[PDB]
Amino acid sequence: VLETTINHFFSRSGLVGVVNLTDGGTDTTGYVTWDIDIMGFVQLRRKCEMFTYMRFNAEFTFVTTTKNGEARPYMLQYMYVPPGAPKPTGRDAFQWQTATNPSVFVKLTDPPAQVSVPFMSPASAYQWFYDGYNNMMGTFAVRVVSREASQLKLQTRVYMKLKHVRAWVPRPIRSQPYLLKNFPNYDSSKITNSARDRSSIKQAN
């Protein structure tokens, strides 16, 4: 009976996105920003759309490797830009020194960093259906900490885990392919069907 609880249903941290960082000195930006979006991959997206309103805390983990993947003692900076705050415009730009944006410093050889983000909304809950005229959680930014640009190539894999999930007003599960993010469009011309087809209605097997 336990595995059917909403809370157990959204648990089990998984990959919410991947960004590739490269330090090329001038030619490459040398940093990366990743906006927080639950809906990037459609697995969880289909599950969040099952409910109108939700509330929860987020827990993130950053797995990072270098190309072929061998690790070396370089320092990294994961800064969190809360909603309604400017994002770093450059590798060395002054936003990295802004104290209101929390940062975590970790050597690349270390076990991955974990961070907990609380419920950020002004409303009482997140809503992925708003009929009228969203839900910005924040953004993460990564760079390498050095005076001189260290030529390096990175990819970070963001694993997110929800905590203390509460839902309201369930919805039906989408039967049509997703055309694009942030809108529930569907192809009108071709319409997939809920169940497959059989020979005759009078025959079961």
Binding site: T52, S124, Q127, D131, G132, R171, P172, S175, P184, S194
Partner: protein, 201 residues
């Protein structure tokens, strides 16, 4: 005959603690134009509070008053002879959102309402077979000609702007097409009635 569906099981109530709670002509029975339903039809939907944005004294109170709160009492009737056969699914969808098939009229149809293009998907891209997880009632001409649904105020914030945000919508979709032998009236009307409950401004 009293058979009533409380949405989610909660009576509309005034907000837990100054807003105005007018009832003289404010809370009373508003009846729309009737929809004439035919063999080839698709089915209809309405947006609230929108449908009342220009009506009576409520549309006036819907004007100004950038904060809005209320419930509703929805009654739906169908006048059909014993020789007509068919069924209607009457549902109430919070935050009902029409999508693109690839406009403000689709989002805000007004008093008349609008008709579906692809009802099977609800024009939300969602299977109609599952629409029954919503507060709903069947209108089946074989038994009942009328359905009544009570909707409390449902939102993630205690107050909102009635103009720019429609809280939910109402949907009548014929599941089984209207059928009649020749000579009977060829179009059956559907009447809609809205009674606000515990309105605040």
């Amino acid at each position: 005959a009293a058979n009533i569906v409380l949405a989610y099981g909660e009576w509309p109530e005034y907000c837990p603690d100054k807003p105005t709670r007018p009832d003289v002509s404010v809370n009373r029975f508003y009846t729309l134009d009737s929809k004439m339903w035919q063999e080839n039809s698709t089915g209809w939907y309405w947006k609230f509070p929108d449908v009342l944005n220009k009506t009576g004294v409520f549309g006036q109170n819907a004007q100004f008053h950038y904060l809005y709160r209320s419930g509703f009492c929805l009654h739906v009737q169908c006048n059909a002879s014993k020789f007509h056969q068919g069924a209607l699914l009457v549902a109430v969808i919070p935050e009902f959102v029409i999508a693109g098939r690839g406009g403000f009229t689709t989002t805000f149809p007004g008093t008349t309402g609008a008709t579906f293009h692809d009802p099977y998907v609800l024009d939300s891209g969602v299977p109609l077979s599952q629409a029954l997880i919503y507060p709903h009632q069947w209108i089946n001409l074989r038994t009942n000609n009328c359905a009544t649904v009570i909707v409390p105020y449902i939102n993630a914030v205690p107050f909102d702007s009635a103009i720019n945000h429609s809280n939910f919508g109402l949907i009548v979709i014929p599941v089984s097409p209207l059928k009649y032998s020749s000579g009977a009236t060829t179009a059956i009307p559907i009447t809609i009635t809205i009674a606000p409950l515990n309105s605040e401004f």
